[PDB]
C-alpha cells in the first residue's frame, strides 16, 4: 500500500563530492550566519569557493551554481524564497533532510556515554512524572495532556535520540572495523598491537554502554507496567495503551541491541583474533600476498594441480533406491453422497418424540412412563421397540422428575408391551 504511495510521490536525494562539499559549506556558514538566512548572493560565492578548491571549470560559475542550487532544491535539500530586496533577490534555507545529512558528520558524534546517562536520567524523570499523572487519572482532556501529548512526543523523541546514540555507536564500531582493516593494509605485522588495543577499547566502550542501558531499563520497565496498570483508569485510554504498548518494545529493543551488539562484537573480535594467527604470522613479511597475486595473474604458465588420495572416498553398494510399498490400488469410488437428517433413522422420531413430550412440558401434564411407553410402542415393531424405548426415555426424563421418588416407595415394573418388556418408573410430576 505504501509502495504506490511512494511511487506516485516521486522523490530523490543524492550528492556528488562537490555538491556534498557545498552542502557542508552552506551549513557551516548558516551556523556562522547572523540571522540564519542565506541569500543566493552568498550561495553563489560559496559554490565558487568550493569549486575553486576542487578546481573544475566545465562552464561559467553562474550556470554551474544555478544548476547545483536547483538540483539541491529539487532534491529536497534546499528551500527557496523569493525576496526582491534580498541580495540576488532570493533567500535559501536548509531543509530538515539537509540538516540531518550535515549534522550526521559535523555535529559531534557524541559517543560519550555521559550523553546516554543524562538521557536515561531525563527519561526516568519524565516517565515517572507521566506515570504519576496517569495514576492521578483526571478527565479525558487531562488524561490526554498528561499521557499522550507530553508522553507520546517526549518519550518518542528521547527513545529516538537514545537510538541515535546507539546508531552513533554502530557507526563508530563500523569505523573502527574499517580502520583496523586499513591499518593492517599499511602496517601489516606492525598493526597487531594497534588492532588489539582498538578491540580492547571498543569492547570496553560496548560494555560500558550495555551497563548504562541496563542501569535504568528494569526500573523503566517497572514504570511502564505502572502506566499499564493506571491506563485502566479511563475507558478511552485505548490509544494510551498503544503507546504503553509500543514504548515497551522500543525499550526492550534498545536493551536487545545493547546486548546484541556485544554478541556480534565479541564474535567479530575472535575473527580478527584468529586472523592475526591465520593471516600474518604465516605471512609476516607480506611477500606471500604479492607472490600469490602474481601467480594468479600468470597461473597457466605454471600448470600444476594438487595430488590427493581422492581416487575413491568410500565405494559401496548403492541403496535400494525408491523401492516402495505399492499395489496399483483400486477401490469402489464413492457414489453420490447420501444425506440423512442427523441420524434421521433415529432423529425423525427424536423430533416426533421431543414434540410429543414438549407438549407434556408445555402443559406441565403429569407423565406416566408406563402408559406413554405402552401407548407409543404399538406404532413400531418389536425388534425396534428397545431402540424406541431409549429414545423416549432420554426425552421423557429430562422433563422434570418424579416426586414420588422421594417418598421412599419403590416404583413397580409396569408392563408396556407384549413379549415381557417392563419399565420401572415413578410418575413424573415436578417440572
Amino acid at each position: 500500500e505504501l509502495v504506490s504511495w511512494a511511487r506516485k510521490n516521486d522523490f530523490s536525494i543524492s550528492l556528488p563530492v562537490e555538491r556534498l562539499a557545498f552542502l557542508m559549506a552552506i551549513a557551516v556558514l548558516n551556523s556562522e550566519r547572523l540571522d540564519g538566512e542565506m541569500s543566493e548572493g552568498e550561495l553563489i560565492d560559496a559554490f565558487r569557493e568550493v569549486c575553486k578548491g576542487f578546481e573544475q571549470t566545465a562552464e561559467s560559475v553562474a550556470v554551474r551554481a544555478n544548476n547545483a542550487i536547483n538540483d539541491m532544491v529539487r532534491q529536497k535539500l534546499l528551500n527557496r524564497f523569493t525576496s526582491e530586496l534580498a541580495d540576488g533577490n532570493a533567500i535559501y534555507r536548509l531543509t530538515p533532510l539537509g540538516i540531518s545529512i550535515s549534522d550526521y558528520y559535523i555535529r559531534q558524534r557524541e559517543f560519550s556515554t555521559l550523553r546516554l546517562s543524562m538521557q536515561l536520567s531525563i527519561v526516568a524523570n519524565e516517565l515517572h512524572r507521566a506515570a504519576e499523572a496517569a495514576e492521578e487519572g483526571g478527565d479525558e482532556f487531562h488524561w490526554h495532556r498528561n499521557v499522550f501529548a507530553p508522553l507520546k512526543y517526549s518519550v518518542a523523541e528521547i527513545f529516538d535520540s537514545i537510538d541515535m546514540s546507539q546508531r552513533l555507536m554502530d557507526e563508530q564500531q563500523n569505523f573502527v572495523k574499517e580502520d583496523i582493516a586499513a591499518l593492517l593494509n599499511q602496517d601489516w605485522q606492525a598493526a597487531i598491537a594497534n588492532c588489539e588495543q582498538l578491540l580492547s577499547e571498543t569492547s570496553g566502550t560496548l560494555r560500558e554502554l550495555q551497563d548504562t542501558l541496563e542501569a535504568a531499563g528494569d526500573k523503566l520497565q517497572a514504570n511502564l507496567l505502572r502506566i499499564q496498570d493506571a491506563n485502566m483508569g479511563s475507558g478511552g485510554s485505548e490509544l494510551v495503551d498503544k503507546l504503553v504498548f509500543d514504548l515497551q518494545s522500543k525499550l526492550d529493543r534498545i536493551i536487545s541491541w545493547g546486548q546484541q551488539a556485544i554478541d556480534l562484537w565479541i564474535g567479530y573480535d575472535r575473527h580478527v583474533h584468529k586472523f592475526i594467527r591465520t593471516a600474518i604470522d604465516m605471512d609476516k613479511n607480506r611477500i606471500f600476498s604479492q607472490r600469490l597475486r602474481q601467480s594468479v595473474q600468470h597461473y597457466f604458465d605454471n600448470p600444476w594441480t594438487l595430488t590427493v588420495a581422492n581416487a575413491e572416498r568410500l565405494l559401496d553398494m548403492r541403496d535400494e533406491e525408491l523401492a516402495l510399498r505399492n499395489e496399483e490400488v483400486t477401490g469402489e469410488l464413492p457414489l453420490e453422497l447420501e444425506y440423512e437428517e442427523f441420524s434421521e433413522i433415529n432423529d425423525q422420531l427424536a423430533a416426533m418424540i421431543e414434540k410429543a413430550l414438549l407438549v407434556y412440558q408445555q402443559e406441565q401434564r403429569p407423565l406416566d412412563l408406563g402408559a406413554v411407553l405402552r401407548d407409543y410402542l404399538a406404532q413400531h415393531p418389536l425388534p425396534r421397540h428397545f431402540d424406541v424405548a431409549r429414545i423416549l426415555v432420554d426425552q421423557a426424563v429430562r422433563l422434570g422428575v418424579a416426586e414420588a421418588d422421594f417418598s421412599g416407595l419403590p416404583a413397580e415394573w409396569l408392563a408396556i408391551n407384549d413379549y415381557g418388556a417392563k419399565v420401572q418408573a415413578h410418575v413424573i410430576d415436578t417440572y
Binding site: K177, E178, I180, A181, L184, N185, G267, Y268, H271, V272, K274, F275, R277, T278, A279, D281, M282, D283, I287, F288, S289, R291, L292, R293, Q294, S295, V296, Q297, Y299, F300, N302, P303, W304, T305, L306, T307, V308, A309, N310, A311, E312, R313, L314
Partner: protein, 205 residues
Amino acid sequence: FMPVKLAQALANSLFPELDSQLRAGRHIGIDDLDNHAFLMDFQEQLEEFYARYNVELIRAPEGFFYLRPRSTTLIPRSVLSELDMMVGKILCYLYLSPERLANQGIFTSQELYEELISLADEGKLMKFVNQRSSGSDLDKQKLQEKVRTTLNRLRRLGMVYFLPNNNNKFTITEAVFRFGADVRSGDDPREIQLRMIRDGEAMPV
C-alpha cells in the same frame, strides 16, 4: 607397540573425523576444524603414522595441513583440475585479504566470481571450461556454473563449508593456502612445482 603421544592422538574423540576425512581428500584448516584443532597437537605423530600408508600429511610454512599420497601410496591417488586451483587461489587471496575481514569469513559465490574475473583473464580462462568458446555469454554462464560446481567439489575436499542455511554463502578453510603452494616461498613457481611433483604434492593435468 606405539609411542604414548601417538596412541593418545589416535585415542582422541576427534581423531576418527580427522583420519576419515583426510582419507576422503579433505584438508586441514581453520574450517575443517575437527581435523585441525588437535592435529595441531600431534602433527609429527600423525605424519609418521600416515607414512605407514605411504602418504604424507604436509604442512607448508602456512598453518594448514593436507594429505599427499606417494607413488607407492597404499590409498590410491587422484588430482584436481585447473579451475579448482583457480578458485582455490582466489579463495586464498580472500582468506589473506584483511580488507574483507568485515565479512568475518563469510563469502558469496557472486563475490568469488567477481574477484576471479577481476584478477584473471575472462577469455583465456574460459578457453578451458570449453575449448571452442569465443566470448559467448552462454560460455560465461557455463563458466559461472562450473565455478559453482568446483566450489562444491572443494567443499567435498575440505576447502570451503556451506552455511547450514545457505549454500550460496560459505566459510573458507585454511587448507585454501594449499593452493598457494607455488607461492609459499620466493623461489621460482616452476622449480617449486618440480619440488611438489617430487614430493607428489602437485602435477600438471
